[PDB]
UniProtKB/Swiss-Prot annotation, chain A:
It comes from Homo sapiens (Human). It is found in: Nucleus. The BC-box, which mediates binding to the elongin BC complex, has the consensus sequence [APST]-L-x(3)-C-x(3)-[AILV]. This is Elongin-A. Heterotrimer of an A (ELOA, ELOA2 or ELOA3P), ELOB and ELOC subunit. Part of a multisubunit ubiquitin ligase complex consisting of elongin BC complex (ELOB and ELOC), elongin A/ELOA, RBX1 and CUL5. Interacts with ERCC6; the interaction is induced by DNA damaging agents or inhibitors of RNA polymerase II elongation. Interacts (via BC-box) with CUL5. Residues 18-27 are annotated as: BC-box. Transmembrane segments: none annotated. The gene is ELOA.
Swiss-Prot record, chain B:
This is Elongin-B. Residues 1-66 form the Ubiquitin-like domain. It is found in: Nucleus. The modification Phosphothreonine is found at T84. The lineage of its organism: Eukaryota, Metazoa, Chordata, Craniata, Vertebrata. The modification N-acetylmethionine is found at M1. Belongs to the Elongin B family. Pathway: Protein modification; protein ubiquitination. The gene is ELOB. Keywords: Acetylation, Host-virus interaction, Nucleus, Phosphoprotein, Transcription, Transcription regulation, Ubl conjugation pathway. It comes from Homo sapiens (Human). It comes from the Eukaryota.
Swiss-Prot record, chain C:
SIII, also known as elongin, is a general transcription elongation factor that increases the RNA polymerase II transcription elongation past template-encoded arresting sites. Subunit A is transcriptionally active and its transcription activity is strongly enhanced by binding to the dimeric complex of the SIII regulatory subunits B and C (elongin BC complex). Core component of multiple cullin-RING-based ECS (ElonginB/C-CUL2/5-SOCS-box protein) E3 ubiquitin-protein ligase complexes, which mediate the ubiquitination of target proteins. By binding to BC-box motifs it seems to link target recruitment subunits, like VHL and members of the SOCS box family, to Cullin/RBX1 modules that activate E2 ubiquitination enzymes. Component the von Hippel-Lindau ubiquitination complex CBC(VHL). This is Elongin-C. It comes from Homo sapiens. CDD domains: BTB_POZ_EloC. It is found in: Nucleus. The gene is ELOC.
UniProtKB/Swiss-Prot annotation, chain D:
This is DNA-directed RNA polymerase II subunit RPB9. Component of the RNA polymerase II (Pol II) complex consisting of 12 subunits. DNA-dependent RNA polymerase catalyzes the transcription of DNA into RNA using the four ribonucleoside triphosphates as substrates. Component of RNA polymerase II which synthesizes mRNA precursors and many functional non-coding RNAs. Pol II is the central component of the basal RNA polymerase II transcription machinery. It is composed of mobile elements that move relative to each other. RPB9 is part of the upper jaw surrounding the central large cleft and thought to grab the incoming DNA template. It comes from the Eukaryota. InterPro entries: DNA-dir_RNA_pol-M_15_CS, Rpa12/Rpb9/Rpc10/TFS, Zn_ribbon_RPB9, Zn_ribbon_RPB9_C, Znf_TFIIS. The lineage of its organism: Eukaryota, Metazoa, Chordata, Craniata, Vertebrata. Belongs to the archaeal RpoM/eukaryotic RPA12/RPB9/RPC11 RNA polymerase family. A zinc finger (C4-type) spans 8-33. Zn(2+) 1 binds at C8, C11, C30, C33. SMART domains: RPOL9, ZnF_C2C2. The keyword Zinc applies. One of its GO terms (cellular component) is nucleus. It comes from Sus scrofa. Coiled coil: none annotated. It is found in: Nucleus, Nucleolus.
Length: 107, 88, 101, 116
C-alpha cells in the first residue's frame, strides 16, 4: 500500500569543471559549513566570499581575524547592496561602519 | 569501460587504468616493467568480496561500481609471497 | 618513477606517496613549469616531487581528480562532477594554488 | 517605435499635433493657451499589432527573490555569470500564444533578464 509521490521542475550540470572550479562551486553550495580556513589568502577565496551573507562574513572574520584587512573591499559590496544611500567619512573601514549601522538599526 | 583498483602498499601506491577484462598478474607485470616489482613481490590482500584466484578481472567481487571514476576501492597490499606480511 | 615518461611519482612529505600517469597529468599548468623546467629531455623522467604539507587523502583525491578530468577531457561524457569532502576541500583549495588546474 | 506624449509648458497641460502650412511643418500646439512647439519627430499615432516580441521591459528584476518562482542552474547569466536563475512565463493575454521562459538572474544587483 505504498503511495507513489514525487515532483519535478520542468525545463528546456553539463559543465567542464576543473579543480579550482570544482572547489569554488562546492564551497558555493556549502558556505556556512566553514569553521576556519587556516591561512588561505583572499584572492583564491574571491568568488565564494562574493556569494555570501554578512552573518557568515562575521563568523569568518571572528574565526579568521587576520583576513579582515583584505575583506573590507568586499564589505563595500555589501554596503552598496544594503546601505546604498550612504558614504563613509574619513578614516572609516567598511566592516566596522557596516556593523555600526547594523547595531544602530537593530537598536 | 575502465578499471580502478587502489594498489596500496603503505608508503607506495600504484594506480590502474585499463578495460573491464584483464589478468591479475598482467597488472603485476605492468608494475614490474616500471616500478620493478618481480612476481615474488605480490600477495594481493582481499577485496570487498573474495579476491579472485582464477586470475581474470571479470569475476566475483568485481563489478562496474568498483571501477568507478568517482570513487576508488582502497585496500592494503603486501610485497611478499610467504616470508613476511608487511604493513607500514 | 623510472626513465619512462608515462609514470610520474609525487610525494607530499608524508608516508603514502602516489604515482600517477603523465598522460593523465597533461592538464596541469605546473607540470609545464616544474616537470618541464628550464629544459625537456630527461628532466621529466626524474618523477621526484618532494612537495610538503599536503595530507595523504588530499593529494590522493587531487591526483584522482587529475586522471578523472584528463580521461574526461574531450571524452564522450560531459555531465559528471566529483565528490570532494567539504572539510578536505578547504586544504584542496591550497592545491588550487600549486597544481594550477 | 512608440512616440510619447508632448506636454505644454505654460498651462502644464497636454499638447496636440497640428500642421502649419506656413513652414509646412508639424507643431505641437496647446489648445488651452497660445503655446506652440515644433516637433522633433513626425510620428503622431503609432500602433503595434504583431510587434509584441519584447516582453522584457514588463519584467522587473525583483522577481529573482520570489520563493515560489522556480530556480534553475542550467542557464547562467551573461552579464555576471551567476549559476542560479529564476525562470517563468509571460502571463499576459498577449502572451497566451507563447510558453517562452523568461529568466532573471538570482544574484543581487545583477538584474539581467533574458530568454532561451
Ligand atoms: Zn498650454
Ligand atoms: Zn547575472
Amino acid at each position: 500500500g505504498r503511495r507513489m509521490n514525487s515532483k519535478m521542475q520542468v525545463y528546456s550540470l553539463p559543465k567542464m569543471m576543473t579543480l579550482h572550479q570544482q572547489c569554488i562551486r562546492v564551497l558555493k553550495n556549502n558556505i556556512d559549513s566553514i569553521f576556519e580556513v587556516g591561512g588561505v589568502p583572499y584572492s583564491v577565496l574571491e568568488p565564494v566570499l562574493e556569494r555570501c551573507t554578512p552573518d557568515q562574513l562575521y563568523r569568518i572574520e571572528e574565526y579568521n581575524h587576520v583576513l579582515i584587512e583584505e575583506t573590507d573591499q568586499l564589505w563595500k559590496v555589501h554596503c552598496h547592496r544594503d546601505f546604498k544611500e550612504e558614504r563613509p567619512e574619513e578614516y572609516e573601514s567598511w566592516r566596522e561602519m557596516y556593523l555600526r549601522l547594523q547595531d544602530a538599526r537593530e537598536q | 569501460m575502465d578499471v580502478f583498483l587502489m594498489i596500496r602498499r603503505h608508503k607506495t601506491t600504484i594506480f590502474t587504468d585499463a578495460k573491464e577484462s584483464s589478468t591479475v598478474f598482467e597488472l603485476k607485470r605492468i608494475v614490474e616493467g616500471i616500478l620493478k616489482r618481480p612476481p615474488d613481490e605480490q600477495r594481493l590482500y582481499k577485496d570487498d568480496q573474495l579476491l579472485d584466484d582464477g586470475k581474470t578481472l571479470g569475476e566475483c567481487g568485481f563489478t562496474s561500481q568498483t571501477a568507478r571514476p568517482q570513487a576508488p576501492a582502497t585496500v592494503g597490499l603486501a610485497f611478499r609471497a610467504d616470508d613476511t606480511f608487511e604493513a607500514l | 618513477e623510472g626513465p619512462d615518461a608515462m609514470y610520474v611519482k609525487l610525494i607530499s612529505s608524508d608516508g603514502h606517496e602516489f604515482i600517477v600517469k603523465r598522460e593523465h597529468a597533461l592538464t596541469s599548468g605546473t607540470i609545464k613549469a616544474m616537470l618541464s623546467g628550464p629544459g625537456q629531455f630527461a628532466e621529466n623522467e626524474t618523477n621526484e616531487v618532494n612537495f610538503r604539507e599536503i595530507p595523504s587523502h588530499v593529494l590522493s583525491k587531487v591526483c584522482m581528480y587529475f586522471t578523472y578530468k584528463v580521461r574526461y577531457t574531450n571524452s564522450s561524457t560531459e555531465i559528471p562532477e566529483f565528490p570532494i569532502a567539504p572539510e578536505i576541500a578547504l586544504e584542496l583549495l591550497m592545491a588550487a594554488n600549486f597544481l594550477d588546474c | 517605435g512608440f512616440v510619447g506624449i508632448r506636454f505644454c509648458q505654460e498651462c502644464n497641460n497636454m499638447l496636440y499635433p497640428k500642421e502649419d502650412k506656413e513652414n509646412r511643418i508639424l507643431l505641437y500646439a496647446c489648445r488651452n493657451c497660445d503655446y506652440q512647439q515644433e516637433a522633433d519627430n513626425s510620428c503622431i499615432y503609432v500602433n503595434k499589432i504583431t510587434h509584441e516580441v519584447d516582453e522584457l521591459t514588463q519584467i522587473i528584476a525583483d522577481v529573482s527573490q520570489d520563493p515560489t518562482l522556480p530556480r534553475t542552474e542550467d542557464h547562467p547569466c551573461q552579464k555576471c555569470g551567476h549559476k542560479e536563475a529564476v525562470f517563468f512565463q509571460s502571463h499576459s493575454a498577449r502572451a497566451e500564444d507563447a510558453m517562452r521562459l523568461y529568466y532573471v538572474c538570482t544574484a543581487p544587483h545583477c538584474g539581467h533578464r533574458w530568454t532561451e
